[PDB]
Coordinates of C-alpha atoms and ligand atoms in Angstrom, one line a residue:
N1 CA -25.0 -2.0 8.6
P2 CA -25.9 -3.9 11.8
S3 CA -24.2 -6.9 10.3
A4 CA -21.0 -4.9 10.0
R5 CA -20.5 -6.3 6.5
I6 CA -18.1 -5.1 3.8
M7 CA -20.2 -2.8 1.6
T8 CA -19.7 -1.9 -2.1
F9 CA -20.4 1.5 -3.7
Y10 CA -20.9 2.7 -7.2
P11 CA -20.7 6.5 -7.1
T12 CA -21.7 8.5 -10.1
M13 CA -19.2 10.9 -11.6
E14 CA -20.8 13.8 -9.7
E15 CA -20.5 12.0 -6.4
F16 CA -17.0 11.0 -7.2
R17 CA -15.6 14.5 -7.5
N18 CA -15.7 15.4 -3.8
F19 CA -13.6 12.8 -1.9
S20 CA -14.3 13.8 1.7
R21 CA -18.0 14.2 0.9
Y22 CA -18.3 10.7 -0.4
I23 CA -16.4 9.2 2.5
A24 CA -18.8 11.1 4.7
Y25 CA -21.6 9.6 2.6
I26 CA -20.6 5.9 2.8
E27 CA -20.3 6.4 6.6
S28 CA -23.9 7.6 6.6
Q29 CA -24.7 4.3 5.1
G30 CA -22.8 2.4 7.8
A31 CA -19.8 1.3 5.7
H32 CA -17.3 2.1 8.5
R33 CA -18.7 -0.6 10.7
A34 CA -17.1 -3.3 8.6
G35 CA -13.6 -1.6 8.8
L36 CA -13.3 -1.9 5.1
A37 CA -15.3 -0.8 2.0
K38 CA -15.0 -1.1 -1.7
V39 CA -15.6 1.8 -4.0
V40 CA -15.9 1.1 -7.7
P41 CA -15.2 4.3 -9.7
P42 CA -17.2 5.5 -12.7
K43 CA -16.1 3.7 -16.0
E44 CA -15.4 7.1 -17.5
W45 CA -12.7 7.8 -14.9
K46 CA -9.0 6.8 -15.3
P47 CA -5.9 7.8 -13.3
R48 CA -3.5 7.2 -16.1
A49 CA -3.9 6.8 -19.9
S50 CA -1.4 3.9 -20.2
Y51 CA 0.9 1.7 -18.0
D52 CA 3.5 0.9 -20.7
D53 CA 5.9 3.6 -19.6
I54 CA 6.8 2.1 -16.2
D55 CA 8.9 -1.0 -17.0
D56 CA 12.1 0.9 -16.1
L57 CA 10.9 2.4 -12.8
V58 CA 13.1 1.2 -9.9
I59 CA 12.0 -0.9 -6.9
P60 CA 14.7 0.1 -4.5
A61 CA 14.1 -2.4 -1.7
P62 CA 12.3 -5.5 -2.9
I63 CA 11.2 -7.7 0.1
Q64 CA 11.5 -11.5 0.1
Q65 CA 8.7 -12.8 2.4
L66 CA 9.7 -15.8 4.6
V67 CA 6.8 -17.2 6.6
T68 CA 7.1 -19.5 9.5
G69 CA 4.2 -21.2 11.4
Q70 CA 1.5 -23.9 11.4
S71 CA -2.2 -24.4 12.2
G72 CA -3.4 -21.0 10.9
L73 CA -0.8 -18.9 12.9
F74 CA 2.2 -17.5 11.2
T75 CA 5.0 -14.9 11.5
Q76 CA 6.4 -13.2 8.4
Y77 CA 10.1 -12.3 8.2
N78 CA 11.4 -9.7 5.7
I79 CA 14.5 -10.3 3.7
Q80 CA 15.6 -7.3 1.6
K81 CA 16.8 -8.1 -1.9
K82 CA 18.8 -5.8 -4.1
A83 CA 17.1 -3.1 -6.3
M84 CA 15.1 -4.2 -9.3
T85 CA 13.0 -2.8 -12.2
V86 CA 9.3 -3.3 -12.8
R87 CA 10.4 -5.3 -15.9
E88 CA 12.6 -7.6 -13.9
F89 CA 10.0 -8.0 -11.2
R90 CA 7.3 -9.0 -13.7
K91 CA 9.7 -11.4 -15.2
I92 CA 10.3 -13.1 -11.9
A93 CA 6.6 -12.8 -11.0
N94 CA 5.4 -14.6 -14.2
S95 CA 8.2 -17.2 -14.1
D96 CA 7.1 -20.8 -13.6
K97 CA 8.6 -20.9 -10.1
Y98 CA 6.5 -17.9 -8.8
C99 CA 3.4 -17.7 -10.9
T100 CA -0.3 -18.2 -10.0
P101 CA -1.5 -21.8 -9.8
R102 CA -4.5 -22.9 -11.9
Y103 CA -7.9 -23.0 -10.1
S104 CA -11.7 -22.8 -10.5
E105 CA -13.4 -20.9 -7.7
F106 CA -11.8 -18.2 -5.5
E107 CA -12.4 -20.5 -2.5
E108 CA -9.8 -22.9 -4.0
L109 CA -7.1 -20.3 -4.6
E110 CA -7.6 -19.1 -1.0
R111 CA -7.1 -22.7 0.3
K112 CA -3.8 -23.0 -1.7
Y113 CA -2.7 -19.7 -0.3
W114 CA -3.1 -20.9 3.3
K115 CA -1.7 -24.2 2.5
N116 CA 1.5 -23.0 0.7
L117 CA 2.1 -19.8 2.6
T118 CA 5.4 -21.0 4.2
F119 CA 6.9 -22.6 1.0
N120 CA 8.8 -20.9 -1.9
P121 CA 9.1 -17.4 -0.4
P122 CA 7.9 -14.8 -2.9
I123 CA 9.2 -11.2 -3.4
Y124 CA 7.1 -8.1 -2.8
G125 CA 7.8 -4.8 -4.4
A126 CA 6.4 -2.9 -1.4
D127 CA 6.7 0.6 0.0
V128 CA 7.9 2.2 -3.2
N129 CA 7.7 5.9 -2.9
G130 CA 5.8 7.3 -5.9
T131 CA 2.5 7.7 -7.6
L132 CA 1.1 6.5 -11.0
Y133 CA -1.6 9.2 -11.2
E134 CA -1.4 11.5 -14.2
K135 CA -0.6 15.1 -12.9
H136 CA -4.0 16.5 -13.7
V137 CA -6.4 13.9 -12.2
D138 CA -8.3 15.9 -9.6
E139 CA -10.7 13.1 -8.5
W140 CA -9.5 10.7 -5.8
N141 CA -5.9 11.5 -6.4
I142 CA -3.9 9.7 -3.8
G143 CA -1.1 12.2 -4.0
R144 CA -3.4 15.1 -3.0
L145 CA -6.8 14.0 -1.4
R146 CA -7.0 17.3 0.5
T147 CA -8.3 16.0 3.9
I148 CA -7.4 17.4 7.3
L149 CA -4.4 15.0 7.5
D150 CA -2.8 17.8 5.5
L151 CA -2.6 19.8 8.8
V152 CA 0.4 17.7 9.8
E153 CA 2.6 18.9 6.9
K154 CA 0.9 22.3 6.9
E155 CA 1.7 23.0 10.5
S156 CA 5.1 21.3 11.0
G157 CA 6.5 20.6 7.5
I158 CA 6.7 16.9 8.5
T159 CA 6.3 14.2 5.8
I160 CA 5.9 10.6 6.7
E161 CA 6.5 8.3 3.8
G162 CA 3.4 6.2 2.8
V163 CA 1.3 8.0 5.4
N164 CA 0.9 11.6 4.0
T165 CA 2.8 10.6 0.9
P166 CA 1.9 7.8 -1.6
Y167 CA 3.3 4.3 -1.8
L168 CA 3.3 1.8 -4.7
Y169 CA 3.1 -2.0 -4.2
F170 CA 4.2 -4.5 -6.9
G171 CA 2.9 -7.9 -6.0
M172 CA 3.1 -11.5 -7.2
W173 CA 1.2 -14.6 -6.2
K174 CA 1.2 -15.4 -2.5
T175 CA 2.7 -12.1 -1.4
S176 CA 0.9 -11.0 1.8
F177 CA 0.0 -8.1 4.0
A178 CA -0.2 -9.0 7.7
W179 CA -3.0 -8.1 10.1
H180 CA -2.8 -4.4 11.2
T181 CA -4.6 -1.1 11.6
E182 CA -3.1 2.1 10.1
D183 CA -0.5 4.2 11.9
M184 CA -2.4 6.4 14.5
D185 CA -5.4 4.3 13.5
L186 CA -5.9 6.5 10.5
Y187 CA -8.0 5.8 7.4
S188 CA -6.4 4.4 4.3
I189 CA -7.2 4.3 0.6
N190 CA -5.9 1.6 -1.7
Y191 CA -6.1 1.7 -5.5
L192 CA -5.3 -1.4 -7.7
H193 CA -3.9 0.1 -10.9
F194 CA -3.6 -3.2 -12.8
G195 CA -3.0 -6.9 -12.7
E196 CA -4.5 -9.9 -10.8
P197 CA -6.8 -9.3 -7.8
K198 CA -5.9 -8.5 -4.2
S199 CA -8.0 -10.3 -1.6
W200 CA -8.7 -8.8 1.8
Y201 CA -9.9 -9.9 5.2
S202 CA -11.3 -7.5 7.7
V203 CA -12.4 -7.3 11.3
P204 CA -15.0 -4.7 12.4
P205 CA -13.6 -1.9 14.7
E206 CA -16.2 -2.7 17.2
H207 CA -14.6 -6.1 17.5
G208 CA -11.0 -5.1 17.1
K209 CA -10.2 -5.6 20.8
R210 CA -11.3 -9.2 20.5
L211 CA -8.8 -9.9 17.8
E212 CA -6.0 -8.3 19.8
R213 CA -6.9 -10.4 22.9
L214 CA -6.8 -13.5 20.7
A215 CA -3.4 -12.5 19.2
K216 CA -1.9 -11.7 22.6
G217 CA -2.9 -15.2 23.7
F218 CA -1.3 -16.8 20.6
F219 CA 1.8 -14.7 20.7
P220 CA 2.6 -14.1 24.5
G221 CA 6.3 -13.4 23.9
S222 CA 5.7 -10.7 21.3
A223 CA 2.9 -9.3 23.4
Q224 CA 5.1 -8.9 26.5
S225 CA 7.8 -7.1 24.4
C226 CA 5.5 -4.5 22.8
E227 CA 2.1 -3.0 23.7
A228 CA 1.1 -3.0 20.0
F229 CA 3.0 -5.9 18.4
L230 CA 0.5 -6.2 15.5
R231 CA 1.9 -2.9 14.3
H232 CA 5.1 -4.7 13.3
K233 CA 3.0 -6.1 10.4
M234 CA 4.5 -9.6 10.8
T235 CA 1.4 -11.6 12.1
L236 CA -0.7 -13.7 9.8
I237 CA -3.9 -15.5 11.1
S238 CA -6.1 -17.6 8.7
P239 CA -9.9 -17.1 8.5
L240 CA -10.4 -20.6 9.9
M241 CA -8.6 -19.7 13.1
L242 CA -10.7 -16.5 13.4
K243 CA -13.8 -18.6 12.9
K244 CA -12.6 -21.2 15.4
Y245 CA -12.4 -18.5 18.1
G246 CA -15.5 -16.5 17.2
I247 CA -13.9 -13.4 15.9
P248 CA -16.3 -11.8 13.4
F249 CA -14.7 -11.0 10.0
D250 CA -15.5 -10.5 6.4
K251 CA -13.8 -11.2 3.1
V252 CA -13.6 -9.3 -0.2
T253 CA -11.6 -9.5 -3.4
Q254 CA -10.3 -6.4 -5.1
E255 CA -10.2 -6.2 -8.9
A256 CA -7.9 -3.9 -11.0
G257 CA -9.5 -0.5 -11.2
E258 CA -11.1 -0.7 -7.8
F259 CA -10.7 1.3 -4.5
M260 CA -10.6 -0.1 -1.0
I261 CA -11.1 2.2 1.9
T262 CA -10.1 1.1 5.4
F263 CA -11.5 2.8 8.5
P264 CA -10.0 3.9 11.8
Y265 CA -9.1 0.9 13.9
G266 CA -10.1 -1.5 11.2
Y267 CA -7.9 -4.5 11.2
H268 CA -7.1 -5.9 7.8
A269 CA -4.9 -8.4 6.1
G270 CA -4.7 -10.2 2.7
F271 CA -2.7 -11.4 -0.3
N272 CA -2.1 -10.9 -4.0
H273 CA -3.3 -13.3 -6.7
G274 CA -0.4 -12.7 -9.1
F275 CA 1.5 -9.9 -10.7
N276 CA -0.3 -6.6 -10.0
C277 CA 0.3 -3.0 -8.8
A278 CA -1.3 -1.0 -6.1
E279 CA -1.1 2.5 -4.7
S280 CA -2.0 3.7 -1.2
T281 CA -1.7 6.4 1.4
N282 CA -3.5 7.4 4.7
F283 CA -6.1 10.2 5.2
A284 CA -8.3 11.5 8.0
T285 CA -11.8 12.8 8.9
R286 CA -12.9 14.7 12.0
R287 CA -14.0 11.4 13.5
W288 CA -10.4 10.1 13.3
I289 CA -9.1 12.7 15.7
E290 CA -10.4 10.8 18.8
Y291 CA -9.0 7.6 17.4
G292 CA -5.7 9.4 17.0
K293 CA -5.8 10.6 20.6
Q294 CA -6.3 7.1 21.9
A295 CA -4.2 5.0 19.5
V296 CA -2.0 2.5 21.3
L297 CA 1.4 2.7 19.7
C298 CA 4.4 0.4 19.2
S299 CA 6.5 0.8 22.4
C300 CA 9.6 -1.1 21.2
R301 CA 10.5 1.5 18.6
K302 CA 10.3 -0.8 15.6
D303 CA 7.3 1.2 14.4
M304 CA 8.4 4.8 14.7
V305 CA 5.3 6.6 13.4
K306 CA 3.9 9.0 15.9
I307 CA 1.9 12.0 14.9
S308 CA 1.3 14.9 17.3
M309 CA -2.4 15.3 17.9
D310 CA -2.0 18.8 19.4
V311 CA -3.0 20.8 16.4
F312 CA -6.0 18.6 15.8
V313 CA -7.4 18.9 19.3
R314 CA -6.8 22.7 19.4
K315 CA -8.5 23.3 16.1
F316 CA -11.4 20.8 16.2
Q317 CA -11.9 20.2 20.0
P318 CA -11.0 23.5 21.6
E319 CA -13.4 22.9 24.5
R320 CA -11.5 19.7 25.4
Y321 CA -8.0 21.0 24.8
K322 CA -7.2 22.0 28.4
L323 CA -8.8 18.8 29.7
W324 CA -6.9 16.6 27.3
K325 CA -3.5 18.3 28.0
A326 CA -4.2 17.5 31.6
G327 CA -4.9 13.9 30.9
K328 CA -8.5 14.0 32.1
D329 CA -10.3 13.6 28.8
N330 CA -12.1 10.3 29.2
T331 CA -14.1 10.4 26.0
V332 CA -15.3 6.9 24.9
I333 CA -15.3 5.9 21.2
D334 CA -18.5 4.6 19.6
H335 CA -17.4 2.8 16.5
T336 CA -20.8 2.8 14.9
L337 CA -21.1 6.6 14.8
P338 CA -20.4 8.3 11.4
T339 CA -18.0 11.2 11.0
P340 CA -19.7 14.6 11.8
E341 CA -19.3 15.9 8.2
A342 CA -22.1 13.5 7.3
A343 CA -24.6 15.7 9.2
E344 CA -25.4 17.0 5.7
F345 CA -26.7 13.6 4.8
Ligands
FUM401 O1 -1.1 -3.4 -0.9 C1 -0.8 -3.8 0.2 O2 0.3 -4.4 0.4 C2 -1.7 -3.6 1.4 C3 -1.7 -2.2 1.8 C4 -2.8 -1.8 2.7 O3 -2.8 -2.4 3.9 O4 -3.7 -1.0 2.4
NI402 NI1 -3.2 -1.0 5.7
ZN403 ZN1 6.8 -2.7 18.8

């Protein structure tokens, strides 16, 4: 993938059964270079039989998204609204005030998004603790993917909501997720259970630093107050602005029943088309560990997520442990290399 483009994969059912194996596989095909990949699951597969039993599930902290800005640069402020049911949310979402506008091609809906971003602030049913997987689904179950990120809980008993536990996201039209990488620059997986699409933008890891340099220049005040201000998840930057400043990026639209995988240090952002529902969590491979060791974290304590790398280095880099503890490990990351578990491919 020398073009670092978003790739799309159609695993067979046999390939689908071993999660870590297939992630290792798509990396052997260069997928990680785009920062983002789509995985379409076998038609046979389904995580839940029916989504009619969820209208009474509570969204404890719905978020009203106020957006301020102009010329492709925006800052998103969160206003927490009182609790709400999935029924209530859908009712608001499908109301005339908040529903999807009519359009022909995607390119048109995208233009309207970037044109009306700051008007009529929508509500996002985001960061809801929970899963919609049926208890017995053993393939790609976001609640229990069984990757080495499990060493965090296994070793320390620590749970970090949304990171090694699942989150649910109820969206409506024009609800957004700002530019960011994952906590500790982990992987993530995102499954769209149902509803209208979710569109994504992505910047290749090998160009991540370019985007940060651009963002620091456009938000000097935020940059001075925090070493990793993009981790606040408040900064929106349109594709025209990226284009204008030569930041490479790709686009992809996610349909219900599809997986998105994001890769270590892959910046991504996007928006929802209308009423929908998504589930996500983080995960790891051996390749992540070095990213974990070098992740630049939020220094102003708004983003509190810090994972101790010690168990990972000890168990998977024993020859570098003493060097690393003494701050003399100057390993340099090559974003093009696949995770070692792909040696088998
Ligand atoms: O569904 C969302 O809000 C996006 C979550 C993610 O960044 O994976
Ligand atoms: Ni993310
Ligand atoms: Zn910060």
